[PDB]
Design a protein. Structure first.
Lengths: 307, 120, 310, 216
């Protein structure tokens, strides 16, 4: 279907309609623009040729707007070559648009998608706390607690909690590897004590706890929080998978890799490393102990209960 | 290697003698005693650990240094103490071969054989 | 790096999925596990003799296997079977003696036997593992039934097949009879402190044998100090019910033949320190004007002694 | 720039030298070389740029064009961007038999040829630089000799070491054990391997001129 459409060259007509004057003030025009953007996104599928053709007219599609942001995000969803050669002007324009409009989930989502296929991390560091703001202050802690209480029924997906989650995801993506600069910047903007206080807090939400764990005197005390978050589901749709997806792995590395030059430590380590996985023994051999859960079962009944 | 084995055997024999003089030794303790006796016999004989009978040791010449160490290291003293304690009354030497005390008789025979080998 | 001559003391400080020295508790303990916290490959731990692993040729136990089968279950042929078994044992001994110093022909079949165990480390074919739910048993057999020795898999996969394996090259204990190479027992061993057994399964890690030392001179080695002044060595004796260090007055004409077993002394370095291996204590000196004595260990700074060059 | 110098055309070498002396862009030119020559050392497509870079450098230094060789060592510039040291270390970047295979042999041949053309002429300073280098590269050249395209690697290493001793032998002898050298010479007797063995034999004679045990 994409090849037939490209042969028909309807992409040019769709782009012209998108760039056609709208005379904002009529809901029909907005609906037509949204439908055109959705059609363009549908025609911006994984086919690298179509993605390159769409990106060619990036200037027209690079405008401040929810539909424009969605189209731009869908343009380079998986194009490794296209995303790698992303010019820093695009990132600068996205940052400026986010600063001007303010808190927009679309811009953060587009940035996160583009990141996963250094400049983005550098710009975010230059961007300060206006957009990527860490709620580590005591007053910030009270504000975060109030937001979590407001999210008792659910997460608004666009409120400050959603913006913080998106910022954390973007920071993790920038430092997903061993990037010294990105990791240092994230650590500076993400104090460990704040994570210990919040994630370990009872009011901490499953999504927020998973975000904090993925983003991550801290690893020697965060083991207790991880254990407190072990049987949370056992004691939902995606309850357990938030934690166990990462919780064991890095810990096993901490128990095996040399990154943790404290292989022997106080009872919080010399004993937790011999008791924690025991509380997951049922989890390790649970009826659902298959796949990644089974892998962590093997890594825990074997290793995480040995140190 | 012989010196280290002798030191380990001396420690094990001291522990076993203490346990015997104190009280009964459980099935695990009896198995450990039997294993210690077998290891001592193998070390003293110096012959390859073939399927030959336990009381079927016939060597050309034992290790002079090994024998001297066993005599000095209280290995012979350990065997003598084990023999003395087993009688004192831990064993009356009358209920043997009754399908109940057979392990004790086997251990005593192994200890006597080890002592005789050390007396080569 | 040089050809692994058969018969040299060996040791495999495994560094695969986990890191630790592979050995057993000794004596009659029928289990071979690792001790990650006991020591490091770059930081060898105490009791180095515990790592003594002699390399021997693969055992031949065909007639021995027949004799064992006969014993398990005729009488007339028993004498002939015993004679054949004796001949086979002699042949096996000759083969083991022949390979003394033989280079490690990549892919060749040899075995490693612990000096303390004085037996070949074998794997129980039709026996489940002591701890692992889905693994097989393995122990040390006094003689072996051709399963004692296994193949050496070039874990480095660089040395030419059959090439003289460079000492320390990445090698694994490929199971000759079992087919499942050595696998580290990741199981969180509780009964044995810091225990990690070795099973016979298909894994992705192993350990490489390392040659020992055939001992401004030798360092951490256990040797004897003979006092030329007394034409003998200063040993330790349980005199008057107490340990005392003195020069033994041996009544044997051959001074060099006085191997009383009390001449065990260990030397340490720092920047030597003398440890009385005879009793496990450490030598020292105090008032008499002064006299030598033994203390629990050499940790005390007072245990220092001076060695003077010839 | 590589097809402009095919056959070691001297005139274009002189033209490059004059351009880099006169035009102020010199320090920037070498940058995009050194930067791209310091993007594979730390990495270990960049290698497909390293190969042309080394062919190009060899062509500039081809035909014993000493002035280009010195210009490629020091440059007499405010900030020096050395390329003989960089290529030597990159070559440095017997546990190598697994790390030279059917995807890194042409590149290593190019690197050894480049290291040869820098000092094959009696460029004393560059030979001293290559030998008095704290990267063991002189040792990896030996390892290359001792440990089909393997024959070409051996021959190129022999040529490089011969170049290193024109008008050093003691430093080289530290790495290669003479008995092993004679062993490899004899084995090479069975590009045909006879001539590789012969080049190693010439290197052996040159070394023996400063040694006694080899003479035996």
């Amino acid at each position: 279907q994409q090849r037939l459409l490209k042969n028909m060259d309807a992409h040019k007509v769709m782009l012209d309609l998108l760039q056609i004057p709208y005379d904002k003030g009529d809901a029909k025009m907005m609906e037509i623009l949204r439908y055109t953007h959705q059609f363009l996104q549908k025609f911006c599928a994984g086919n690298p040729g179509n993605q390159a053709l769409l990106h060619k007219h990036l200037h027209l599609f690079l405008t401040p707007g929810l539909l424009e942001a969605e189209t731009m995000q869908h343009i380079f969803l998986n194009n490794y070559q296209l995303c790698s050669e992303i010019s820093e002007p695009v990132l600068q324009h996205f940052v400026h648009l986010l600063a001007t409009h303010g808190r927009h989930v679309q811009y953060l989502d587009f940035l996160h998608t583009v990141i996963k296929a250094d400049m983005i991390m550098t710009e975010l560091t230059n961007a300060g706390d206006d957009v990527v703001v860490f709620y580590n202050d005591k007053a910030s802690l009270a504000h975060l607690l109030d937001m979590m209480k407001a999210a008792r029924d659910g997460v608004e997906d666009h409120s400050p909690l959603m913006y913080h989650i998106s910022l954390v995801d973007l920071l993790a993506a920038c430092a997903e590897g061993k990037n010294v600069y990105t990791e240092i910047k994230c650590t500076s903007l993400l104090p460990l004590e704040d994570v210990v206080s919040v994630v370990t807090h009872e009011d901490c939400i499953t999504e927020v706890k998973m975000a904090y764990v993925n983003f991550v005197n801290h690893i020697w005390t965060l083991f207790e929080n991880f254990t407190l978050d072990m049987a949370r589901v056992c004691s939902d749709p995606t309850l357990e998978k938030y934690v166990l997806s990462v919780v064991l792995d890095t810990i096993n590395a901490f128990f095996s890799s040399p990154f943790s030059e404290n292989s022997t430590s106080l009872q919080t380590h010399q004993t937790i490393v011999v008791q924690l996985l025991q509380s997951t023994t049922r989890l390790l051999e649970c009826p659902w102990l298959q796949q990644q859960h089974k892998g962590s079962v093997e890594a825990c009944i074997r290793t995480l209960a040995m140190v | 290697r012989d010196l280290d084995f002798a030191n380990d055997a001396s420690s094990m024999l001291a522990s076993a003698v203490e346990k015997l003089n104190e009280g009964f030794i459980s099935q695990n303790d009896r198995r450990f005693v039997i294993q210690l006796l077998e290891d001592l016999v193998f070390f003293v004989s110096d012959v390859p650990n073939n399927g030959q009978n336990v009381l079927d040791i016939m060597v050309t010449k034992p290790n002079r240094e090994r024998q001297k160490l066993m005599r000095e290291q209280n290995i012979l003293k350990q065997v003598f103490g084990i023999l003395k304690a087993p009688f004192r009354p831990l064993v009356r030497l009358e209920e043997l071969s009754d399908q109940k005390n057979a392990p004790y008789q086997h251990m005593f025979r192994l200890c006597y054989r080890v002592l005789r080998h050390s007396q080569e | 790096s040089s050809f692994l001559h058969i018969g040299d003391i060996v040791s495999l400080y495994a560094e695969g999925s986990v890191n630790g020295f592979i050995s057993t508790l000794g004596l009659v303990d029928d289990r071979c596990v690792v001790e990650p916290a006991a020591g490091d490959l770059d930081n060898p731990p105490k009791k180095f003799r515990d790592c003594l692993f002699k390399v021997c040729p693969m055992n031949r136990y065909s007639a021995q296997k027949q004799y064992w089968k006969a014993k398990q279950t005729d009488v007339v042929l028993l004498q002939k079977l015993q004679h054949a078994a004796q001949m086979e044992q002699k042949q096996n001994d000759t083969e083991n003696k022949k390979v003394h110093g033989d280079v490690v022909k990549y892919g060749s079949v040899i075995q490693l036997l612990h000096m303390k165990s004085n037996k070949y480390l074998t794997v129980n074919k039709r026996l489940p593992a002591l701890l692992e739910k889905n693994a097989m048993r393995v122990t040390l057999d006094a003689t072996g039934n051709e399963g004692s020795w296994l193949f050496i898999q070039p874990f480095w996969k660089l040395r030419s097949n059959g090439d003289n394996v460079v000492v320390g090259d990445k090698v694994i204990l490929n199971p000759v009879n079992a087919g499942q190479p050595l696998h580290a027992s990741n199981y969180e061993l509780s009964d044995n402190a810091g225990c990690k057994e070795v099973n016979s399964v298909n894994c992705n890690t192993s350990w490489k044998i390392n040659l020992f030392m055939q001992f401004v001179l030798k360092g951490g080695d256990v040797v004897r100090l003979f006092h030329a002044e007394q034409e003998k060595f200063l040993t330790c004796d349980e005199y008057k019910g107490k340990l005392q260090v003195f020069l033994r007055t041996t009544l044997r004409q051959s001074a060099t033949s006085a191997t009383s077993s009390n001449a065990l002394w260990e030397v340490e370095v720092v920047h030597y320190r003398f440890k009385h291996l005879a009793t496990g204590n450490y030598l020292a000196a105090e008032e008499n004007k002064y006299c030598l004595v033994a203390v629990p260990h050499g940790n005390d700074i007072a245990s220092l002694f001076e060695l003077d060059p010839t | 720039a590589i097809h402009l110098l095919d056959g070691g055309n001297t005139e274009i070498q002189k033209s490059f030298h004059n351009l880099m002396m006169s035009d102020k862009k010199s320090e920037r030119f070498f940058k995009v070389l050194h930067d791209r020559m310091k993007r594979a050392q730390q990495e270990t497509t960049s290698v497909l740029i390293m190969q042309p870079i080394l062919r190009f450098l060899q062509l500039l230094c081809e035909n014993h064009n000493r002035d280009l060789q010195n210009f490629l060592r020091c440059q007499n510039n405010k900030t020096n961007y050395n390329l003989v040291c960089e290529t030597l270390q990159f070559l440095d970047i017997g546990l190598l038999g697994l790390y030279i295979n059917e995807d890194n042999v042409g590149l290593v041949i190019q690197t050894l040829e480049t290291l040869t053309e820098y000092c094959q002429g009696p460029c004393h300073e560059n030979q001293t630089c290559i030998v008095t280098h704290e990267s063991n590269g002189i040792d990896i050249i030996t390892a290359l000799i001792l440990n089909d395209l393997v024959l070409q690697l051996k021959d190129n290493a022999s040529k490089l070491l011969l170049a290193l001793m024109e008008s050093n032998a003691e430093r080289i002898l530290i790495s290669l054990r003479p008995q092993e050298l004679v062993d490899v010479i004899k084995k090479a007797y069975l590009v045909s391997p006879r001539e590789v063995g012969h080049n190693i034999y010439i290197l052996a004679l040159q070394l023996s001129r400063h040694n006694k045990q080899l003479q035996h």
